[PDB]
Amino acid sequence: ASPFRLASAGEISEVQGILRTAGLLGPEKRIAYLGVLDPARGAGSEAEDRRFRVFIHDVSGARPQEVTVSVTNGTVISAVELDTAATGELPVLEEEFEVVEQLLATDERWLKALAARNLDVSKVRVAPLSAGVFEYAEERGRRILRGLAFVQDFPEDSAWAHPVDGLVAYVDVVSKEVTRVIDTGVFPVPAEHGNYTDPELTGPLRTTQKPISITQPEGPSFTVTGGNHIEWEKWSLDVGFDVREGVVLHNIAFRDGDRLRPIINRASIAEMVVPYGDPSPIRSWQNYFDTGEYLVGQYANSLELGCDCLGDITYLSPVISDAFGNPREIRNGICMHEEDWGILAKHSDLWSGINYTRRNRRMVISFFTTIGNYDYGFYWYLYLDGTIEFEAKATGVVFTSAFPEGGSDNISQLAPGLGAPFHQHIFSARLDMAIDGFTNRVEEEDVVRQTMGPGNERGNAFSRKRTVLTRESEAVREADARTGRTWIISNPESKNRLNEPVGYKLHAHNQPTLLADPGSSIARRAAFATKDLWVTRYADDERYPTGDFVNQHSGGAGLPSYIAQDRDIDGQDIVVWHTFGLTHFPRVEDWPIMPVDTVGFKLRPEGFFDRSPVLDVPAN
Amino acid sequence: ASPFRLASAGEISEVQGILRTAGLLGPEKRIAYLGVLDPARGAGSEAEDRRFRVFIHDVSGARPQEVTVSVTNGTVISAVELDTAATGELPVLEEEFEVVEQLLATDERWLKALAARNLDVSKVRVAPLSAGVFEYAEERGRRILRGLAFVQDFPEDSAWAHPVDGLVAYVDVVSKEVTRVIDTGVFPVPAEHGNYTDPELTGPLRTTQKPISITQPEGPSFTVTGGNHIEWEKWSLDVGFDVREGVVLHNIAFRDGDRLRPIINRASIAEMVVPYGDPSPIRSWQNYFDTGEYLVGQYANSLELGCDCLGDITYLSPVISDAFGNPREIRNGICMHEEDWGILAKHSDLWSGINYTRRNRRMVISFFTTIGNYDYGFYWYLYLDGTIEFEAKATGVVFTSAFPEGGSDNISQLAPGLGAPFHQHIFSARLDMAIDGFTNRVEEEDVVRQTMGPGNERGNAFSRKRTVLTRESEAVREADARTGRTWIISNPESKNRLNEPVGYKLHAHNQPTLLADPGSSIARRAAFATKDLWVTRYADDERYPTGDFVNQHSGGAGLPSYIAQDRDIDGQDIVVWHTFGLTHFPRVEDWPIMPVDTVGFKLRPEGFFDRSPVLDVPAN
Ligand SMILES: [Cu+2]
Ligand SMILES: [Cu+2]
Ligand code: NA
């Protein structure tokens, strides 16, 4: 019944049938993206119209189309032809990955480059990577992938251990032609294997780890109704899934007495970019927009009980479309469970004689995706005390290169002759805020130091200052760890019992933002990543910080063009966009497979409640 | 056997007997501090000499003494008379705390102040707080406590809800004299109760929480030998306990194949200061040095199974001295357990077809202390991948005041008429480093941005730079979150297989440091707290960043005096001192009892190993 329910296999089948009968899904067509549209703004929305947005690619070279269909009425609502030289190319298709290696294997220039290195072409894997926009005028309007080569010594070998440096190729995946093959010189192919399951490398496995058993003998404390509606320890929310963004949280609300109080209307990771900082022409174009270009939801892992998710686990199995419109289930793609989280509150009072201890816990909603060599876990946490937290976990295998003789200022050495270029992993969280309703505002809070003098004779005083962000042109903010800078989202029309606006405080990790030169292509295409915080006025079509079609878009789409409207955000329906990321100088310990590193952010109540909201937690 | 074993009840009894026999522990003497001395630098050394350091107070006014005793040989090694007006007073005795409320209850100035407020003296509790050093000349060379008053309506009432603002008294606890009573005016005593176990405030307790069962059917994976030596998943260490510092970690080392490789010789929280930022004369002197003035180990809680520590727990019960030299056991004062810690490493490889997942775990060593209204948990974590982490958890009841009718820039309102002054909680971690041995150096590492141009034509390159700190005068460093600043401790004489020096990287949280004006009393006494990182050359007597005698001591001791020696620290026996803290602007949700907030730091290997150290972790 809920408009926020996960797409079903039947809905996707009906979308396929509607497109085919409309003539929009012939044999040269591919679905590059399909997803359900959220309901438009309207608190009296009663008639359910479930609609899907579809991007349709054409493998024969015709212009692609953006289509909106209504599965409820069985109709096409609109179909627009796209001019990709203007507004960007469609996301990369899974079937285009294989094309790159196959086309190169018959190209005379590629084979000559391999022959000079004495590499058997049957052992050379090609990583198919997004192209970006650089100096090559012939690429405008064409779907290009760029290929970098790795040697696989045998079928189970880790090819990442054996990069073929000094060589790159560009491929038109529609006309199926190799546009350029660039050979800048011969580098030795690193010879050590990186096979982390080979006993010769691992040594004898440890026998010292004893089991940890985590069970819930009465079942979990949360309930799941309607397929994806969660109720847990006064929290209420809907868990969505979109093939582009992955797990999306809707309608995050907290039951305060007899009142269901909204907090966040929609929470998602709306983009993530991985820019590389190696100036070699072999790699200086390399920037992954994992969300915008590749679609992180379509590569979600099936998560195995006891290994990926430990404890009393409830799974969701989202359904997505394949390239032809057939439904495909991601079995066990989302894990949900509660976890003990240590002490919540504790005090032993001398005067009253009362000793008080309570334990904390958190609800975990997670999924894991694999894009080539990297694997990312996305974790949303709800805590008893009203805190909301997001954490990204980065693991997998680092992207490699040769390590040049003489060293490098932009590449780490991991093994003899094996390098790992410096890079970042930068995320954008899109938080469509709804603190006690939709009339919200953002304040920047800095610590204020005070000078010793009159009214501060001992020089001990300090204070804080809050600055209201009233218009989009002033709502592009930077972190300042030194002044303890945070941002508060409040509702100026909803007061707590002390007559103060209710609010939530955003605590950032204050990691470095995008390091590339401001005049670079990546800085223009990933402009969101240059600043820590953006606030926009809500609009239906402003979904991603990089725009709708990120692949080979020349730049400026998304947040810089939204902000340019300079709209009122002082007590309005607003969206907070938080940039946060990891700067990765690879270390020897990251090889041959990388231990998890993490980054994230959290939101804590700030006068949202009239007192601590966990006074009714029992002792157990 | 082990020179790092915990003090035994027998050793403490023997110290008492030795001091008695020497004429140093008659009826008028009190032990203010007693602790074991670490072995001096030198392998083997004096076969076994257990030495104890004792601070002896005299309740008749005679000068106190510092005494060193050898329990092994039954001898006093040295005894020196202290000039406390010069070098500082001894730590506060537990028995002096009770004196303050009793003396004030018979002082006619105090009674007049309470009668003016219509308060019954039998219901007024006095918080006895350390005095610091301010403008009062009569306090030099005397042991002073200052008292702030709270009303307790009935014996089980939380007095913190009812501060009596506008009133403070100073007490000489040796001569039993009230020196000053300062009354700046009547404030209403806030009337709402703060009794977090009263059903009228909590409402009905939740029935929704289902049990989480954490068990270890085969027992834990660590072994405890010699009372306090831990071996766990390649880690080796000794867990010490000192009445001033609390839990101290010794000889942290990692078994890498056939070699036991040192990492940290001694790790402790060597000071903690809590400065208040309210310029009211009633509170502008308020600064707690919980470690140096109060001794946090003395107030460690007994931790109860299932509430404080959950899972398969191994306890230590350290022994301390009371004020007469009798041994006192802190039953179950230290918890030790291992915890699941999610995914360690994960990759699903398209080309090889191998899917790989491993789980992480950590070893936890913790204790909890209660000082008046505040309770602090101290947590040390060891991870499978070589990471070492410290976390402090702050909870308890916030210190209160009246909330002035015209508002305040330095106090938060928590309830009608009830305020909570702004303050910080700042920690100093002392890390006596031993990365692969004692020849170490510290490098500061910053991200380096590069401009677009020749050799960086696409403007994507970025780099890093390392600066060796070669002498103490240049080793006082500040955080810079914007440039991703970290510090690496390396050993230039011990290289990994790539011929790079082995190292560990310190990751700070980059929270604000001390906010007080640099000319204030607290900035001089807590000078360590004004900078994020200090490095000194190791010396036996440089134990605490504030010096040996913090109570009522002006500046002149501690870290600024140590670094003035400008010693060589480039490949030497060095000590890292890291400042980190929380800046607390109390929120309504912190009342009537505060949910845990946290701060800490971590150290991760940086080319210490020749590849990932967790390749031999099994799948289970
Ligand atoms: Cu990385
Ligand atoms: Cu606090
Ligand atoms: Na050292």
Curated annotation (Swiss-Prot), chains A, B:
Keywords carried by this UniProt record: Copper, Disulfide bond, Metal-binding, Oxidoreductase, TPQ
Source organism phylogeny: Bacteria, Bacillati, Actinomycetota, Actinomycetes, Micrococcales
Name of protein: Phenylethylamine oxidase
Pfam families: AGAO-like_N2, Cu_amine_oxid
Catalytic activity annotation: a primary methyl amine + O2 + H2O = an aldehyde + H2O2 + NH4(+); 2-phenylethylamine + O2 + H2O = 2-phenylacetaldehyde + H2O2 + NH4(+)
Residue sites binding Cu cation per the record: H423, H425, H584
EC number assigned by the record: 1.4.3.21
Residues recorded with modification 2',4',5'-topaquinone: Y374
NCBIfam families registered for this protein in UniProt: PRK11504.1
Annotated disulfide bonds: C309-C335
UniProt GO molecular function: copper ion binding; primary methylamine oxidase activity; quinone binding
Organism: Arthrobacter globiformis
Entry-linked InterPro entries: AGAO-like_N2 (IPR054157), Cu_Am_Ox_Cu-bd (IPR049947), Cu_Am_ox_TPQ-bd (IPR049948), Cu_amine_oxidase (IPR000269), Cu_amine_oxidase_C (IPR015798), Cu_amine_oxidase_C_sf (IPR036460), Cu_amine_oxidase_N-reg (IPR016182)
